[PDB]
Amino acid sequence: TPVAKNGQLSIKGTQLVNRDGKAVQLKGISSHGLQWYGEYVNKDSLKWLRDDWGITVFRAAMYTADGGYIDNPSVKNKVKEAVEAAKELGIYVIIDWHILNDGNPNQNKEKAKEFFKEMSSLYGNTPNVIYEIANEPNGDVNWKRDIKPYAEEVISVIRKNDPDNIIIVGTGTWSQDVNDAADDQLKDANVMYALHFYAGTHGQFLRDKANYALSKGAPIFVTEWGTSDASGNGGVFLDQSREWLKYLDSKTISWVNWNLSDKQESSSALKPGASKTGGWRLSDLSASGTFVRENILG
């Protein structure tokens, strides 16, 4: 199992590497918002994904807004649950401070810093953990004015308890505007920038900004991508999805598919009715779910 095999991750240039300094490409899946679908996120289902799908990373998508942590912080217990499972299973785990309607990460910066102080404190001696501090900036929200200053403060409070675990920072326009990041990069040695795409929506233009970012030295991590369109629908777009994953392989970019749930949308891995604890029949999986599993089992 990884972490037992790769240990603690760091960044060599653009390439995510293991403790040996080997190139590593994590592949996995994200929960839906933990406030609605945390029932699917537990040591059993995570175990099933590890054992049946070969996932090497699980993302715990803790919405801040929309009935999430700001209004009900007890959801932090689901993050802690998933993390303990990940440590116990030898897989990596992303703690995703999942902004969306609160499109400016500054809106909730005080609560975000307090949240990350506790997590880095609890888990910062843990090689499993990756922090994702701001899922998707959007609106009149840009790198230089809004996202960078936030990242320095939040980063500064994480590094106190955890100096070396990977931190992934979202970018503008729903974690598309990596080029703006790529120009005015942070100094932290273990920071990556998030790139999100949907196969039914995003095409070559988004890949080019990504190419531009790498060429300027900014590492990229796909903390969220879907085989559906950006709404999370439109059916399951196999040509573009195949085309995207081909591109990501070519640069050894780690990725996390959206999403593990039985929600009634195209992006869901599961068909309605699917067990919360795994042990899923091949039929229980959606058209999306099947494709994603096939692309992790190599």
Kindly describe this structure.
With 298 residues, the protein is of the alpha/beta class. The protein has a single domain, classed as TIM Barrel. Helices cover 35% and strands 18% of the residues. The chain is built from ten helices and ten strands. The strands form two sheets. An eight-stranded parallel β-barrel has the order 3-4-5-6-7-8-9-10, surrounded by five helices. Strands 1-2 form a two-stranded antiparallel ribbon. α4 runs parallel beside α5. The radius of gyration is 17 Å and the shape is globular. The two termini are 16 Å apart.
What kind of sheet is the major sheet? 8 strands, parallel, barrel
- Broad CATH class: Alpha Beta
- Which fold name is given in CATH as the topology? TIM Barrel
Structural class: alpha/beta
What's the order of the H and E elements?
EEEHHEHEHEHEHHEHEHEH
Task: Please state the CA-atom Rg, rounded to the nearest Å.
Answer: 17 Å
* The CATH homologous superfamily: Glycosidases
Helix content: 25-40%
Task: Using the alpha-carbon principal axes, give the shape.
Answer: globular
First-last Cα distance: 16 Å
CATH architecture descriptor text = Alpha-Beta Barrel
Give the strand content: 15-25%
EC number: 3.2.1.4
Protein name: Endoglucanase
Catalytic activity: Endohydrolysis of (1->4)-beta-D-glucosidic linkages in cellulose, lichenin and cereal beta-D-glucans
Binding site for substrate: 32, 36-37, 63, 98, 198, 230-231, 258, 263-265
